[PDB]
Design an enzyme around this catalytic site. Structure first.
Site, PDB file in Angstrom:
ATOM      1  N   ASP A 171      37.617  11.025  -5.326  1.00 45.76           N
ATOM      2  CA  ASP A 171      38.543   9.971  -4.945  1.00 45.76           C
ATOM      3  C   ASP A 171      39.413   9.580  -6.119  1.00 45.76           C
ATOM      4  O   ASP A 171      40.592   9.273  -5.955  1.00 45.76           O
ATOM      5  CB  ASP A 171      37.784   8.732  -4.483  1.00 45.76           C
ATOM      6  CG  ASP A 171      36.944   8.989  -3.255  1.00 45.76           C
ATOM      7  OD1 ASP A 171      37.504   9.441  -2.233  1.00 45.76           O
ATOM      8  OD2 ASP A 171      35.727   8.729  -3.310  1.00 45.76           O
ATOM      9  N   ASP A 189      33.489   8.829  -7.101  1.00 46.68           N
ATOM     10  CA  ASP A 189      33.513   8.926  -5.648  1.00 46.68           C
ATOM     11  C   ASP A 189      32.840   7.697  -5.055  1.00 46.68           C
ATOM     12  O   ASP A 189      31.800   7.257  -5.544  1.00 46.68           O
ATOM     13  CB  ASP A 189      32.786  10.185  -5.178  1.00 46.68           C
ATOM     14  CG  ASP A 189      33.361  10.730  -3.890  1.00 46.68           C
ATOM     15  OD1 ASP A 189      34.544  11.142  -3.901  1.00 46.68           O
ATOM     16  OD2 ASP A 189      32.647  10.740  -2.866  1.00 46.68           O
ATOM     17  N   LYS A 192      30.754   6.009  -2.204  1.00 45.23           N
ATOM     18  CA  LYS A 192      29.824   6.303  -1.113  1.00 45.23           C
ATOM     19  C   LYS A 192      29.354   4.977  -0.540  1.00 45.23           C
ATOM     20  O   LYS A 192      29.174   4.014  -1.278  1.00 45.23           O
ATOM     21  CB  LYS A 192      28.614   7.092  -1.640  1.00 45.23           C
ATOM     22  CG  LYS A 192      28.966   8.435  -2.288  1.00 45.23           C
ATOM     23  CD  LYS A 192      29.698   9.342  -1.296  1.00 45.23           C
ATOM     24  CE  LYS A 192      29.918  10.745  -1.852  1.00 45.23           C
ATOM     25  NZ  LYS A 192      30.541  11.656  -0.848  1.00 45.23           N
TER      26      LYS A 192
HETATM   27 CA   LIG Z   1      34.662  10.012  -0.848  1.00 38.94          CA
END
Ligand SMILES: [Ca+2]
Lengths: 219, 219
Positions: A73, A89, A91
């Site tokens: 991301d 990232d 989550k």
């Molecule tokens: Ca993601």
DNA sequence: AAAGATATCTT
DNA sequence: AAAGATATCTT
């Protein structure tokens, strides 16, 4: 430090953690749903400004995927160090009750970890770290009040679809498990523990290499 | 009717409002992203209010899924007609230019259509209609600067992750194609044509049985 | 263009 | 257990 400041900035949300809806330029407001598909996007969008701020403070450049379906991301790399790129990232998972065993999906294990440039913004080898920002919330029933529009003068009246929202920042290998997180989408599964366990780092792998070597051979 | 009443309310709401971010109960706003992951969520949440109202207006009870992986997004039915339910699911796809051909994924073809009670709120046989609300947008610059948060006094300032957003309502079988829209996730694929074709419903199947029959023997 | 990614949940 | 759903995209 970058990592120490980020994790701290996330704890302080932005203004405060009480996202109640999506607003229009016309000033109209719409509520939020309870399903993860909804809060997942929200959390991810909630984190954008905070990250770009800390990264900026520490002379870092942030790069989001151009083409959809690409990891991660956020990619934090410095102008003078196009070799040590950081990946972040977001989550998110839900919980029916409070402070109970949770588990995240940490991305497929047949993509970039196996093919240096498969589904990833920058070549895997150009990354030294992989930080996972995990969000955990307690589900809530979408009240009938959630099916109506509101005006700016009622933000504190817009009912929330969640409850105890908890966040954490942790390395991907540190919180990964030995069981897959999905089948047909071949995802890496994390440890099945309590929120604290993720914040602490009580995992199963004793190193990065062990993690990568386990999921590159997972069958 | 309920149907034309719906599509009209959707056309309206789309032209009189432009979603631009997520706001907090503290009055803090966060821009949106230009990816289908974020937008499909914003479009879905954008439709709920309109749907619920037009429903109640025509004497209809609305029910949303209890599980994150249950179809359809919305279930409508009259109390005196529990076995004549209507399914409304929202789909989203993007374009890179203006009048450019598109294609949607219309849900899996190995679930509720083959197993009456598989992945669906109410048994399949109870629904007498399956409507699809399709939203189509055009990707933009995606901030590339606007990574900061805003305040209520800067709505018009907040940039938009979309350009040309068009919506349409149409029966699933009417716009359904003969090609899979997904590989591992075995999703049905719609016809590949211009927005207009979807509105005018220029599909390839003559009736709904042709549609079902085809996708039930699909491999 | 079949196959397989991206995220996450349910059986 | 795993296997496969939820929705959409890339290759
Ligand atoms: Ca993601």
């Amino acid at each position: 430090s970058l990592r120490s400041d980020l994790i701290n900035a996330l704890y302080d949300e932005n203004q405060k953690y009480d996202v109640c809806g999506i607003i229009s330029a016309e000033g109209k407001i719409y509520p939020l749903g309870s399903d993860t598909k909804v809060l997942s996007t929200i959390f991810e969008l909630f984190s954008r400004p905070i990250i770009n701020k800390i990264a900026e403070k520490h002379g870092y450049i942030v790069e989001e995927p151009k083409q959809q379906n690409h990891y991660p991301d956020f990619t934090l790399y410095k102008p003078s160090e196009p070799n040590k790129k950081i990946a972040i990232d977001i989550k998110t998972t839900y919980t029916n009750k409070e402070n109970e065993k949770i588990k995240f999906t940490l991305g497929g294990y047949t993509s970039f970890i196996r093919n240096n440039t498969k589904n990833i913004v920058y070549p895997f080898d150009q990354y030294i770290a992989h930080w996972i920002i995990g969000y955990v919330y307690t589900r809530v029933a979408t009240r009938k009040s959630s099916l109506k529009t509101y005006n700016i003068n009622e933000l504190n009246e817009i009912p929330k679809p969640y409850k105890g929202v908890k966040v954490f920042l942790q390395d991907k290998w540190v919180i990964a498990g030995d069981l897959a997180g999905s089948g047909n989408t071949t995802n890496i599964g994390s440890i099945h523990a309590h929120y604290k366990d993720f914040v602490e780092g009580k995992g199963i792998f004793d190193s990065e290499d062990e993690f990568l070597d386990y999921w590159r051979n997972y069958e």
